[PDB]
Paper text:
The first structure of the catalytic domain of RpfC (Rv1884), one of the resuscitation-promoting factors (RPFs) from Mycobacterium tuberculosis, is reported. Resuscitation-promoting factors (RPFs) have attracted much interest since their discovery in the late 1990s. Later, various experiments unambiguously demonstrated that the RPF domain is a peptidoglycan hydrolase. The mycobacterial RPF proteins share a common 70-amino-acid RPF domain and the presence of N-terminal signal sequences suggesting that the proteins are translocated to an extracellular location.
The structure was solved using molecular replacement once the space group had been correctly identified as twinned P21 rather than the apparent C2221 by searching for anomalous scattering sites in P1. The asymmetric unit consists of eight copies of the RpfC chain. Chains A, E and S have the most residues modelled into electron density (Gly1–Lys86) with an extra helix beyond the end of the conserved domain (Gly78). Chain B has the least modelled residues (Pro4–Gly78); the other chains are between these limits. The final refined twinning fraction in REFMAC5 for the deposited structure was 0.463 for . Despite soaking and co-crystallizing with a range of substrates and substrate fragments, for example N-acetyl­glucosamine (NAG), polymers of up to five repeats of N-acetylglucosamine and NAG-N-acetylmuramic acid, and peptido­glycan fragments that are generated by a number of enzymes, we never obtained clear density for substrates in the active site. The structure displays a very high degree of structural conservation with the previously published structures of the catalytic domains of RpfB (Rv1009) and RpfE (Rv2450). In RpfC two residues display an elongated conformation (42GVGN45), very similar to RpfE (137GSGS140), to connect α-helices 2 and 3, while a 310-helix (321GLRYAPR327) is present in RpfB. Based on the structure that we have solved, we propose that the five RPFs from M. tuberculosis have similar substrates, although variation in charge around the active site may give rise to small variations in the specificity for different peptidoglycan modifications.
Numbering used by the authors: 1 to 86
């Protein structure tokens, strides 16, 4: 079973701050935009959601969009980009 390293992706995206909310239009450890978070079943502010809830919503984004949803940081997942970009 694959296990994307979302902690690694979060380090890339936010410096590992699962509660990131700096005013750049992105939220939480994985820097979700609100329209993507809502679209994949997230509610409220991603920065208020647990790491585990954030990861749950990322796993859904991955299945539908691939690691293209994190175009620079996706490689840090440890999944081969050539196979998981879509």
């Amino acid at each position: 079973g694959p296990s994307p390293n979302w902690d690694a992706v979060a380090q890339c995206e936010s410096g590992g701050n699962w509660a990131a909310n700096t005013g750049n239009g992105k939220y939480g450890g994985l820097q979700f935009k609100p329209a993507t978070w809502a679209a994949f079943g997230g509610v409220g502010n991603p920065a208020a959601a647990s790491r585990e809830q954030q990861i749950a919503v990322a796993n859904r984004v991955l299945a539908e969009q691939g690691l293209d949803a994190w175009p620079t940081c996706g490689a840090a997942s440890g999944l081969p980009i050539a196979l998981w970009s879509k």
